[PDB]
């Protein structure tokens, strides 16, 4: 069906989690020698998606006959790497934190 409206509304912590594919646990980015993304860091493929299309991280499942499988060894979905543009993560706060827009 066709787009006719655009709604905007608050997001519950519940719903933020409904978006999320993984909690980002580490401030790491990419490993300094593999330059591949560190797992549970800010670029982890296990959360956000494969870097290369229809190919897992360690290389066990490498093309499209598997679409949607999650590699046992490395844990990455086999889809189009375009997903790294869409898949949200999330950070579980210890203490709650106010959203400054609604404060100031």
């Amino acid at each position: 069906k066709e787009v006719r409206k655009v709604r905007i509304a608050l997001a519950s912590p519940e719903k933020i989690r409904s978006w999320s594919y993984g909690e980002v646990e580490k401030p790491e980015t990419i490993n300094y020698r593999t330059l591949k993304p560190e797992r549970d860091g800010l670029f982890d493929e296990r959360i956000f998606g494969p870097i290369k299309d229809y190919e897992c991280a360690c290389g066990k499942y490498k093309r499209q006959r598997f679409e949607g499988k999650v590699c046992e060894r490395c844990g990455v979905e086999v889809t189009k790497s375009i997903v790294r543009r869409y898949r949200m993560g999330h950070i579980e706060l210890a203490t709650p934190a106010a959203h400054i827009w609604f404060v100031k």
Binding site: E25, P27, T29, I91, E92, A98, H99, I100, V103
Partner: protein, 263 residues
């Protein structure tokens, strides 16, 4: 975080604003498990707020967080959305486009009002997809992939290419724009007449609408692709169909300078 030409790395500011958040959350988690005094837990809890507040809207409250050894505020999500360089005004209400080009402007007294002179080397590129298709329907290349290979090197362009182009752009218009586009005739459609040389030829009568001099002005070219876009241009945006001002109702295309002088 991308490797740019150099093997160097280049990274968006949000990553450093997230890292500051993650450290503080993580360390608060540990100070809790280790039962630290509340003056310590209080201090981190407040720093956590400020990490969240610089991520969401750095600078909004208190000192803006900066990269070490730089005075540059990190650009936070609010910064991205907002302002002249923000998402809305820089990439949603207006983008850069394909099938466009720019050159210096030159008067073309011999043009008819619906025309302009368009450099053929420009026209080659702006219409290049079309040119490839024509190139194979005749025969100057076996298929579209060889056709493109041929126009890569300037030495390997042979004269019958240009006759192929002329066929392509037949009847089609291009758009001309001179910034600042103050009103709707900052853009107007012209049937292009290919020219040697590198300069666009503008028709004398349209210079007023455009506020176009020839003291080095330049003008952008745009090629409407679909049948729909081309029909809009030819009917609604053709120079010849817009002779009157939409503001006063008076003639906009009119004699001026030499044309008056001679008459």
């Amino acid at each position: 975080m991308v490797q740019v030409d150099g093997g160097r790395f280049a990274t968006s500011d949000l990553n450093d604003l997230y890292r500051r958040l993650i450290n503080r959350n993580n360390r608060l988690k540990k100070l809790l498990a280790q039962g630290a005094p509340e003056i310590i837990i209080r201090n981190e809890k407040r720093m956590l707020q400020e990490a969240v507040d610089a991520l969401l809207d750095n600078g909004r409250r208190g000192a803006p967080v900066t990269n070490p050894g730089s005075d540059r505020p990190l650009r936070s999500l609010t910064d991205i959305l907002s302002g002249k360089q923000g998402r809305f005004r820089q990439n949603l209400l207006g983008k850069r486009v394909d099938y466009s080009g720019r050159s210096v402007i030159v008067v073309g007294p011999q043009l008819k009002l619906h025309q302009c002179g368009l450099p053929k080397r420009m026209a080659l590129e702006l219409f290049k997809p079309f040119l490839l298709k024509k190139m194979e329907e005749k025969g100057i290349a076996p298929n579209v992939k060889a056709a493109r290979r041929m126009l890569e090197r300037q030495r390997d362009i042979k004269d019958e290419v240009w006759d192929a182009l002329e066929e392509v752009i037949h009847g089609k218009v291009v758009l001309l724009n001179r910034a600042p586009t103050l009103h709707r005739l900052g853009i107007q459609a012209f049937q292009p007449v290919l020219v040697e040389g590198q300069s666009i030829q503008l028709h004398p009568l349209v210079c007023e609408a455009f506020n176009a001099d020839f003291d080095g002005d330049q003008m952008a070219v745009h090629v409407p692709l679909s049948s729909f876009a081309q029909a809009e241009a030819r009917i609604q945006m053709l120079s010849a169909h817009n002779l009157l001002s939409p503001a006063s109702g008076e003639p906009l295309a009119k004699p001026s300078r030499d044309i008056i002088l001679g008459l």
